[PDB]
Amino acid sequence: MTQFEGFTNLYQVSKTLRFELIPQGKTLKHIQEQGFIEEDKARNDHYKELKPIIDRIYKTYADQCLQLVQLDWENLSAAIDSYRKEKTEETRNALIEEQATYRNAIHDYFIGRTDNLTDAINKRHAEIYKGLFKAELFNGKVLKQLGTVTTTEHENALLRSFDKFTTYFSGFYENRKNVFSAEDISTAIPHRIVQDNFPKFKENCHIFTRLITAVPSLREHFENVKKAIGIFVSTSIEEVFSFPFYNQLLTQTQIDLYNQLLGGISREAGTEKIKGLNEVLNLAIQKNDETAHIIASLPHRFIPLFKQILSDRNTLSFILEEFKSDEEVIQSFCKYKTLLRNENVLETAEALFNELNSIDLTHIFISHKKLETISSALCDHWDTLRNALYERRISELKSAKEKVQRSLKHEDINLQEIISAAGKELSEAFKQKTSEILSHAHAALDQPLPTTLKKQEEKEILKSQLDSLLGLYHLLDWFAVDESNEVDPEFSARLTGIKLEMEPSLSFYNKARNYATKKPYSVEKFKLNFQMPTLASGWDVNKEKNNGAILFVKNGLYYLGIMPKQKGRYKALSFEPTEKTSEGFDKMYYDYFPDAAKMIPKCSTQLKAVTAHFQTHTTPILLSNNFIEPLEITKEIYDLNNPEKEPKKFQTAYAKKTGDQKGYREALCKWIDFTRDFLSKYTKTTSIDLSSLRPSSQYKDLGEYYAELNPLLYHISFQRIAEKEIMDAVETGKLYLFQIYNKDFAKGHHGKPNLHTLYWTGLFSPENLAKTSIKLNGQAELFYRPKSRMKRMAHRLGEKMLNKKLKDQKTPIPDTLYQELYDYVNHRLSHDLSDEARALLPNVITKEVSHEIIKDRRFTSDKFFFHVPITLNYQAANSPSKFNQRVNAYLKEHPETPIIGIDRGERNLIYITVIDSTGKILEQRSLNTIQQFDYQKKLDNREKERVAARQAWSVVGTIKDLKQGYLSQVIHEIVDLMIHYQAVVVLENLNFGFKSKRTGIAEKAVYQQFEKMLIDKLNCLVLKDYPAEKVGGVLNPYQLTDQFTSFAKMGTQSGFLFYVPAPYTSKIDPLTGFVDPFVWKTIKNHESRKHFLEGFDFLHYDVKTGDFILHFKMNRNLSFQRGLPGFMPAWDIVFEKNETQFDAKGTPFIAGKRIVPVIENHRFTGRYRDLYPANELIALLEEKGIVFRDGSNILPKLLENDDSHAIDTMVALIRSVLQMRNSNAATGEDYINSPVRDLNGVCFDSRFQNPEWPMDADANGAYHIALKGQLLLNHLKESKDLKLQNGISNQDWLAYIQELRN
RNA sequence: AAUUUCUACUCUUGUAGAUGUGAUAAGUGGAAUGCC
DNA sequence: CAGTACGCATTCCACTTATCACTAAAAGATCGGA
DNA sequence: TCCGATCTTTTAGTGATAAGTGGAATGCGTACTG
C-alpha cells in the first residue's frame, strides 16, 4: 500500500560541483604581487617529486615486516574447497570468518601484536607503526629508527621545504592507512595475500599435484627447467607447490621471481629465450602424443600471482634503454644514417642481389622458420607456396605422402625447388621485391634528417625511412645464415656481414617507437593554497579564521571570500552584521557539529584528562571547560565506550554474539541518556532543541538514533554585511574576492540553466534553509589552470559564416562538404566545389558574423577554479535498509506496471521497446539519432581514426567525448520515458570477460558505462522543469535504484533496474517462440549427417501454395540437440516458397529471403549473397531425380540417394533456413525472418512492418528482455518471500515463452 | 561555433542534455616490436 | 581442404574497479616576552 | 625558567550488508594441424 512518489528520502548521496572564479578589482593584482600562484606551482611540483620518497619508506617498512612471516595456510584452504564443494551459507560464514582471521593474523605483524614473535621487536614494530601515520616522516624520526634507506641532502632539503605543512599530506596518510588496513579493503596488503593470491597458489598446488600423479615424468623436466633458470635453488619443485612454502612469496621480489619462473626470461632481441614453466606444457601439447592427450584432458594453466600492493616490479629480462629527448634520438639517427651513407651499403646490397642471378639458386637456401611471410610477400597467400612445395615433392616420390609434410618444417629448402614447385614468376617477383626494397632504402638515404618532431609529417617521414630500414633488415633474414647445407660460403659470409651491420636498426626502431608514441607536452591545473595549510576545509564560524573560506550572496551572484594569512599572522578580520535594509553582501554563517557518533566521545569520554583520571580511581569526573554546566562521566559509561575488546556493550554486535537483550537494552538506555546529557551541557549544542527525539527506552538500534540525531546539529543562517567593508577589505588586500561563476550566471541567460546550477540554487533556497534536505560540505579546493597556448582563429567582422545544420533542422551536413561550403562562404576556396556541393548549395542557410566567437576561449587565458562537494537527500540515513524489498513490495502492490527494455550492441547501439503487463507493446523506435545528426556515422570514423593514428605514431585521442555526448541525451530519453510510464527498466546481465573482450575488438565500451551512468542518475534524480517542493524536485529527488558500492555487492536487481540472464535473448520468434535446438559442431561426418537427416519426421510439398512442410520431434537428434528443447512437442518447419509480397507501406520483398555472407575460403572471407533456399532445393531435387510434385513423403527419396552431396546440401539448406539473423552491412537491409507458421496462419517476417510486432532483430531482443522482466514479475507474484530467485534458467525461460506464446 | 567540463548546435553576447571532485593503489585491453 | 584452437616478453597509449575525505575540536609545537 | 596565544597536526567512530546456474549474450584473425 504505497505510491510511486514514495521512493524518495531513503538514503543520502553526495555530489561535487565545479565553478570558475573571477577576481573582482585589485584582488588579482594583490594575488600577483604576493606571488601565491608561483609558490603553489613550486609546492605542487615538490609534492609530486617527493611522493616517491615516502613511498620508499613505506615499501621498506613493508617488506622488512613481511620477511618474518610465520603462519599456517591449511585452514583457509580447507574453508575454500569446502565452499567450492558445498556453496552453503554456513560454509560461506566459516570461509569469511577464517579470511578475517588470516587478514588480522598478518596484520598483527604490522601492528606488533602476534604472540609467536619476540616482545622486543614487536614493541619496535608497534612504535614504528605509530610512527608511520603521524608527522614524523619529515623530521626523520622513523626514518633513522628504521635506519636502512639513505637520503641525500637534496632529499633532505626537499623534505625540509614542507615545514609546518604536513597536513597537505593528509590524503596521502589515509591512502596509505587503507594500504596497511585489514578490513577486506581491495588495496590492503592482508586482503591481497589472503584473497587475491592465496587461492591462486592453492589451486596451483592442486593442479601441479594432479598433473604430477597423472604424468610422473614431468617433475624431471620441471626440475631441469628450474635448474636452468636457477631460481629457488634451495627448494625442490613439489616443495615450491605446497602450502608451507606460502610462508614465502609474500614480498615483492619472491612473487616476481615466481612469476618469472612461470613466464621465462628473455635476453635482448635476436637471441634465444629460456622456456617458462607453462611453455614446456605448451610444447608437450605440441608433441601431440598420448601424453599430450592425457595432459589436455586435465587443465594445464598455472596462473601467475598478482603483484603486491605498494611495491615496484623487478624483472630479470632485458629492459631496453629509453630516450628522454628528441635531440638525442635524432642525432643518434644522424650518425646512424651517416654510417649508412659512408659505408656504401647500396653497392654491396645490389651486388648481393645480383648473385641470385650470377650463381645458381641451388646454392642459395632460405630460412624455413619464416618462409610464411616470404609466401605472403611473393605469392598472394601465405599457404600457397607451402602447399605447392608439398604437392611438388609428392609428385617426385598415405604415410609416404605425409612424409613430405613431416619433413618440410624442419629443414632449409633451396630457392630453385620453390621456383620449380610454384613457377618461374617468383624469380621476377623476387628481383622486383629487392628492387623496391633498395628503392625505399635509397629514398631513405635521399631523405634528409628533420629539425624537430612537433609536426606530424616529421614523424611520418622518420617512420617511413624506419620501415625502409627494417624491411631491408628482414629481407636479409629471408636467407639462411648457417652453412650446414650447400650454400655458397661467400654468399653466406656476405649476408652475415651485411646483416650484423644492420642489426642495431631493429633496436633503433624499437626505441623510436618507445619515444614517439608518448603523450605530447601539455599543462594542466594544480591546487592553490595561498600558504594556508587547511584552506577551505570547513566553513564553520569557529573554524573560518584559519580555514579562510566564506561565501557571499549579492543579488543572485555568489562570491567566494578568501582572507589570507597577512604578514604570517591570522588577522581577525570580522564584519558586524548590518540590517537587511542596508545594501551590501550576505555573508553565510555555517554552524556544524560533524558527527554525533564520532565526536560525542571525542569531546566527553576519550579526552586525555578523563582517561588519566579513570585508570587510577573510580570516582566520577566533572568537566568544566567548553561546558556551560559541568558534565559528569561515571565508570558505568566509560567501561561501555572503552570495553578493552572489539564489541562494545551498547553495540548490536554484543547482542548478536551474546544475546543478553535485557543487558544490551539497559546499556543502550544509559548511553542514550548520557548522549542527551552531553548535548544538553556542551557549549556548541546547548542552544539546539532536542525535543523532536524519542524517549530513551523506545529505541531499538543505536545507529538509528545517530542517523536521527545527525541532521539536527547542522544549520545555516544568513546575515547582511555592508559593502563598504568588503570593498575596503578587497582594496587593502585583507580579503580576496572571487565570484562563483558559470555561464548560467552570465548576462544573456534566457533558458533553463545547467543542473549543477539548479542544485547550487536549491542549496541556498529559503525552503532548504528552514529544513535542510541537501547540505553543503567542506574540503573545497581551488585550482589554477594556466594559459594553455594555442593559436587563435575566429570569425572576424564583415565575414559571412556557415551554420552546421540545413534549413530543415533534421538533416545535418557532412564534414567533408562542411569544410568546402565554409571555404566558399568565407570566399577562401582552395579547391573547386563538387557536384553534391552544387546540389546542396541553395538549400543551406548562412549568417553574418557578430559577437566575435573564439574557439577554445576557456583554454585561451588562465582561469581560477573551485570544486565544492555537497550532500543530497540529507535527512535520510547514510545507507538504505532493504531497498529491493521495498521495490518488490511496491511491484507486488502494483501488478499493472509497464516494462521497458534496453539493448546494447554494435550495429544498433540502443533500442527502445515498451510493453504492458499482458505483453502488448506500447511504443518502439530508434535512437541511433536523437533527431540531430546520427552519432554512429561520426563515432565509427573516430574509432577507425584512432586505430589508424595509433600505428601511424600520431596523437591517439579519446573516445569518451563522443561516447558520453551520445549517452547523455540517450540517458535523458530513457529517464523521460521511465518517469512518464512509471515503468521498470531491464538490461541484460553479461559475464565480465565478455564485455571486456568486446571492448577489446570494438571501441564501444557501452556494455558497462551505460550501466554506470544509468545507475548514477537513477539513484539521485532531479528534473529541471519539475517544481522544487514536489517529488522529483531538488529537495525530494527520485531514488529508484539501490546505492551501488561495488559490483561484488551489486546484484540481480537494483531497485527498478532488472538484470536478466544473457543466453537466448535475441534470436527468438515473438509469434511462437522458435529457436534451433541443434548445434552445427556435432554434425561433422557423413553418417552423423544421415542421422540429422533422419531426425526429422516427414517432408511434404503442399502444391496449393508452394510451401514445403518439414516436421521434427525432439525425441530424435538428441546428440545434435544441446539438451535444451522447446516446450511444444511438435515443430513443423514451413519451408516456404520464395514468393514476393509487399510490406505495410508497399515495398516489394521476397518471403523466406535469407541473406548469408558468401565466404570465399573457410577463413570467414568474402562478401554477402542474396540467396533463396526454396529454388535451391527444387534444383537439388531436379538434379537428383527426386520427385516433389507428388506431395507424399520425400525424405525417403532423399535418403535413398546415399551420395554425400545430397545429404550435405540439404543439411546446408537446413542450416541456411534454421538461422535467425539476416543482415546486410553493404546495403543496410538487416531483418529477421521466422521459418515456423503461427497458429494464426502466417510466418513472421520483419518486413510485415505492423506496429504490434518488432521491426528488427535488436527490437526482438529488447522485446524478449521485456518479457523476461515480465516473467520475473510473475515469479514475484506467486512468491510470498518478498525476494527474488537467483536469476532464471534458460530452459525455464524457454518453457515460459512457449506456454505464453502458444 | 561561445561551455565548471563534455557533447550536438546557433531564434538567442548564447541554446538542449549530462556532469562526484581530489588523491592513491591494483587490474584490464589495444598498437608496434622481437621471441617460441 | 579446411578444423580447431593460440605462450611469452618490452615500450607506449587508453580504460576500469576499488578505497579513502565529505571536520570541528582536542592536542601539541612554539614564540615573544616576561 | 615559565606562560598564554597562536598556528599546525591528530582524532574520534554506528549498522547495515550473498548468493547463486547455464551457455549464449554479438561481430567474426591467423596458423599449425584435424
Side-chain angles (χ1 to χ4, degrees), chain A residues 11 64 80 281 311 318 356 361 411 491 775 894 901 907-908 1052 1082 1122 1156:
Chain A
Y11 60 91
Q64 167 176 322
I80 283 172
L281 271 183
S311 325
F318 179 107
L356 270 78
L361 301 111
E411 104 286 25
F491 173 66
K775 139 155 155 40
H894 286 58
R907 165 52 201 71
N908 294 97
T1052 167
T1082 43
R1122 59 179 82 88
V1156 54

Side-chain angles (χ1 to χ4, degrees), chain A residues 105-120:
Chain A
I106 167 63
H107 186 77
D108 294 333
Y109 284 80
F110 277 129
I111 291 308
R113 170 141 268 95
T114 171
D115 203 49
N116 69 333
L117 219 38
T118 177
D119 318 329

Side-chain angles (χ1 to χ4, degrees), chain A residues 844-856:
Chain A
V844 80
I845 173 65
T846 56
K847 286 176 69 147
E848 189 80 31
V849 179
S850 193
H851 311 348
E852 315 58 22
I853 68 184
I854 271 161
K855 194 192 201 303
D856 271 35

Side-chain angles (χ1 to χ4, degrees), chain A residues 265 274 332 345 477 886 899 993 1018 1077 1207 1213 1242 1259:
Chain A
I265 304 304
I274 166 63
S332 70
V345 195
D477 207 54
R886 190 192 304 275
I899 296 180
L1018 256 288
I1207 299 108
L1213 277 166
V1242 283

Side-chain angles (χ1 to χ4, degrees), chain A residues 160-312:
Chain A
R160 284 321 161 191
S161 80
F162 280 71
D163 51 342
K164 314 272 201 53
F165 220 144
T166 69
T167 68
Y168 200 162
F169 292 84
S170 48
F172 194 112
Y173 270 95
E174 255 313 344
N175 291 162
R176 296 288 110 90
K177 187 184 309 301
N178 41 46
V179 179
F180 295 87
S181 298
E183 320 327 290
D184 170 312
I185 291 119
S186 81
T187 188
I189 283 281
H191 166 82
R192 169 125 302 179
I193 87 164
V194 164
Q195 326 281 19
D196 216 348
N197 276 335
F198 178 67
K200 313 202 320 284
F201 180 86
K202 169 226 60 78
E203 70 86 41
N204 272 322
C205 295
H206 221 56
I207 165 175
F208 174 93
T209 189
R210 194 177 51 228
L211 191 135
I212 273 297
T213 186
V215 180
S217 67
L218 231 50
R219 76 193 293 168
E220 320 303 321
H221 311 73
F222 295 166
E223 197 66 45
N224 311 337
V225 70
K226 197 210 298 166
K227 205 173 306 301
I229 207 54
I231 319 316
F232 306 63
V233 301
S234 58
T235 72
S236 96
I237 186 70
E238 84 288 38
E239 305 302 328
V240 179
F241 294 100
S242 188
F243 299 122
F245 193 63
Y246 202 49
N247 239 28
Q248 277 72 238
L249 314 178
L250 306 133
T251 176
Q252 161 63 30
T253 310
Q254 293 287 310
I255 297 178
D256 213 321
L257 264 304
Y258 184 100
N259 279 358
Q260 259 187 32
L261 174 152
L262 255 294
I265 304 304
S266 310
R267 322 317 84 60
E268 46 61 27
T271 82
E272 73 100 23
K273 154 172 171 303
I274 166 63
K275 293 182 304 296
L277 192 43
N278 274 27
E279 303 299 327
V280 317
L281 271 183
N282 154 284
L283 257 286
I285 289 294
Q286 202 307 337
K287 175 54 52 73
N288 202 36
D289 58 330
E290 101 283 358
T291 79
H293 313 147
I294 210 172
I295 270 176
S297 73
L298 273 308
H300 66 292
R301 172 58 60 133
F302 290 168
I303 39 184
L305 291 193
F306 275 44
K307 204 238 307 185
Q308 278 276 63
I309 296 300
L310 192 43
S311 325
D312 194 14

Side-chain angles (χ1 to χ4, degrees), chain A residues 141-173:
Chain A
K141 163 68 192 66
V142 83
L143 179 153
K144 321 185 240 320
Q145 170 53 33
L146 280 182
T148 52
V149 53
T150 174
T151 44
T152 174
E153 48 65 62
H154 176 76
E155 297 218 15
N156 224 27
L158 213 76
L159 205 65
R160 284 321 161 191
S161 80
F162 280 71
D163 51 342
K164 314 272 201 53
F165 220 144
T166 69
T167 68
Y168 200 162
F169 292 84
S170 48
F172 194 112
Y173 270 95

Side-chain angles (χ1 to χ4, degrees), chain A residues 1233-1256:
Chain A
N1233 204 351
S1234 91
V1236 166
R1237 192 142 291 167
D1238 205 49
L1239 279 285
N1240 169 269
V1242 283
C1243 261
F1244 166 21
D1245 51 82
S1246 35
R1247 277 83 71 87
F1248 277 142
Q1249 310 296 147
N1250 157 276
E1252 281 305 6
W1253 305 112
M1255 321 325 278
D1256 218 12

